[model samples]
Target chain A: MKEAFKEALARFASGVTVVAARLGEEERGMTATAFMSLSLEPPLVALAVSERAKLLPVLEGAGAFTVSLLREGQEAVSEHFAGRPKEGIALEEGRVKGALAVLRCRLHALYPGGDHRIVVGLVEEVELGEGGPPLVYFQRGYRRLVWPS
Target chain B: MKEAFKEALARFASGVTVVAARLGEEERGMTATAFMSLSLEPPLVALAVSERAKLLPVLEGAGAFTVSLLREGQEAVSEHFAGRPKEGIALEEGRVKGALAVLRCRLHALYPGGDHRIVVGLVEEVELGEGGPPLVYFQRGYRRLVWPS
Candidate 1:
């Protein structure tokens, strides 16, 4: 059922993002495809993280976090934080460089979501990177968007 | 700031979906790009709906809803539900036909999200449609994903 659920949900495409948070001297980042814009008036965003995720505890106490939307050709970056190590990729100031956009957020709320925790963030700042196609995840692999002719 | 937030969030690409719910004989659909998979064990999915949305009340009372992941060339279907009605489009069985995939879900939970409400759905069923490219929305317009050769 898990595999089937993954297969069905895979049909829904989404841009990849690196969710990072720093607490004291400890910091961590995770590649997430489960992020979404939640609200507008209060400028909120939400993402789901595994309860056992190493970043979860830090994020819970950190009070602040950042999300960097990855651009096309950054699959290595995605894979790196997704648990594979890739040399030379690192988070600078809590964000990955050359991202399509970055949202600096303050921890908002946490809700129970089965085995995952629904983390809500109130966006406090917005940063835009160079224009280019976004790194998209669809059908369990990285893909690119076909731009206008 | 709202426009800027929208601009930054728009950089995050996503497949379009029509979220629907039926209460008795009345049914309604709303186009959503904010949907995301939430969990695996409980098979959960989530989407944000404007609290003022007509579908919100019905969805809250109906206790069940469906999501149709739109395939490429279904922009009109998306627009029709997004409030720009178009000819020759309607929901059959609480889902748009010819979609890339369809998910039947029972309402799991609801959380406050500023002007939008975060609606969690415990997926109860999955329906896969014809395989094809999915309709994508990015940077405020409909785009296509470039498949590998």
Candidate 2:
């Protein structure tokens, strides 16, 4: 049943992102594809995190987090934050280096979502970067997008 | 401030989806990019709706909706359901004709999100189709993606 669900959703392509948080001298990051823009009037963003993700407690403590949109060449970065550690990686100004954009947000709300936590962020600051094409995930593979005239 | 937020998020490319619901003889559709998979254990999904959306009340009444992931050439379909009327379009098998996949879900939960409502769906059924690349939104336009080697 799990595999069936996974297979069905494999067709739903999505952009990749690294959700990061810093509180008092500690920092944590988690690779996530389950992120989306929530509102424009108040500028809100939403993401889902497994209850087991260590970043949840840290995010609650920090009350602030950042989402760095991954670029096409950043699959290694995505994998790194996803638990496969990569040596010597550093965040630029508290955001992922080489990201297409960064959203600095404060925890706006939280709700129950089965075994995941539905997290909402109130956009406090947004940093634009790269302006390059984005990294996407589909069928368990990394991909890039194109623009047509 | 709104444009600043918009500009920053435009870099976070995401796929397009037509969220639709039917109740009795009434049906509604909306073009949205703000949807995400939430939990695997519970098969949950999330999307945000504007507080002013006419579909919200109908969705609450229907208790179910479907999300159809648009394919690369379905920009017109996206725009058509997105409030720009396109003549002669029809639903195929009760869904967007060429979607890559479709997820039919029952309304699970709702939460306040600024001026939007964070709608959670418990995926009750899923359908696969096309097996083609998906249409994405980025930089204020429709686009497509490529898988990297």
Candidate 3:
């Protein structure tokens, strides 16, 4: 049943992101494809983090976090945060350097899911980074956007 | 503030889906780009819907909904559900025909957002359609994925 669920949900394509939070001197980041813009008036966004994720506790303890929208050719960074642990990759000011954009957010609320928690953030800052195609994931693999000619 | 929020969030790309629900004899669907897979064990997903949207109430009354992931070259269908009104587009079996995939879901929970509501669903059924590229949205417009070589 779980495999069927995983395979079916994989068909819904999405962009990739790295969510980072600092708990005192300890900082953590995690690769997430489950990010979305939630509202406009108050500037809100939400992401799902597995309850067992190491980043979740840090994020809760920090009370604030950042999200970096990955640009094309950033699969290595995605892998590193996804637990592959590549060297020389690091979070610069709570964000990935050269991300398409970054959002500094204050923790808003948390809601329960089955095995995950929906974390909502009230955006406190927005940084538009360099322009480039986004890193997208579909069918369990990285993909690229077909830009207009 | 809203413009900055919109611009920054636009940098995060996503797939487009039409969420549909029926209340009594009335059926409604709204185009959503804020969809994501939330949990696996219970097969859960979530999407953000504007609080003022006509579809929201219908969805709540129905207690069930379906999500149809649009495929590439289906901008017309996307526009039709997005309120632009294109003739001849229809929902078959509570879904848009020719969609890449469809999820039959039961409403699980709803949480308050600023001007939107986070609607979670328990996926009860899944239908995988003919394989094709997904219709993506970024920078406020439709985009396509670059397939493998």
Candidate 4:
């Protein structure tokens, strides 16, 4: 099963996201690639997090969370929040909605997925950043973009 | 909020999926990019659908669903499930666990997103296809594979 999943997922591509939240004074965050837009009328987005993710509790308790879309050439950002041990791991403060883009949302609800938790966030606020290219993930590696004719 | 989401999501890339199910003799399906892996332990995945999507009712009624991962260059398949309002759309007899990728799951739970619903799938079976590139979506457009250096 694991091999099958890994093999299948290897062909899948997704964008990288830094799912962050502040529950009082404690701040928690994790890097995720499994994020998507859920709707537009009422404004909503959804992300899936492993049940064991360290940031799950914070997100649930805070009742609010932010998703930062990583700009192109920002593999460092993805790696940092991915919890991979690396040097020069620094987070620029107050850049949640400024770096590339940020979605400030309140926890709307959750559902039990197979081995993960499906979290829905009702968009409460949005912060746009300077426009730039986006970071992409495929086959466990980063990819560059090419415009179509 | 809607504008921000569109902009942010426009920059992010994602995989395309054809979520299908059979309720008795009825077969229904829809194209979705709002799919992601949520966990590994029990193998969970998540799919978000707009309330107005045609597949919602079938999914709600069947309580069991299958996700088919389209391979690169499978735009026709995507168009069919996306309800492209074109004639000659055909449905093939899909091979379970034999598709480019197939996930058979039971409906575990559902959560209300802004104007959509997040459906959680507890993976019960998985089938992997031969090596092939996956169909991808970004900026409201389809993506092709570019080998990573």
Q: lDDT value for candidate 3?
A: 0.91
What lDDT score is found at residue B64 in candidate 3? Answer: 96
lDDT of each: 0.93, 0.84, 0.91, 0.76
lDDT (tens digit, per residue) of candidate 1 on A32-132: 99999999889999999999899999999999999999999999999999999999989998999999999999999999998899999999999999888
TM agreement with the true structure for every prediction: 0.98, 0.95, 0.98, 0.88
Residue-wise C-alpha lDDT for candidate 2, range A1-149, written one tens digit per residue: 66756776677778899998988778889999999888887889999988999999999899999999998888889988999988777776778977888999999988999889998999999887766778888878887776433
Ranking of all predicted structures according to TM-score, beginning with the best and ending with the worst? 1, 3, 2, 4
Better of 2 and 4 by lDDT: 2
Candidate 2 residue lDDT tens string, B1-149 = 58878887787777888888888888888888888889988899899988888778888899999888888888888888888888876566556866888888999999998888999999888887857778888888887676443
Tens-place lDDT per residue, model 3, B49-145, is: 9999999999999999999999898899999999999989888888888888889999999999889999999999988888878888998889888
Model 3 lDDT per residue over A51-71, tens place = 999999999999999999999
Report the error of model 3 at residue B121, Å: 0.2
lDDT at B133, model 4:
64
DockQ of each: 0.84, 0.74, 0.83, 0.61
Indicate the docking level reached by candidate 1: high
Better of 2 and 3 by TM-score: 3
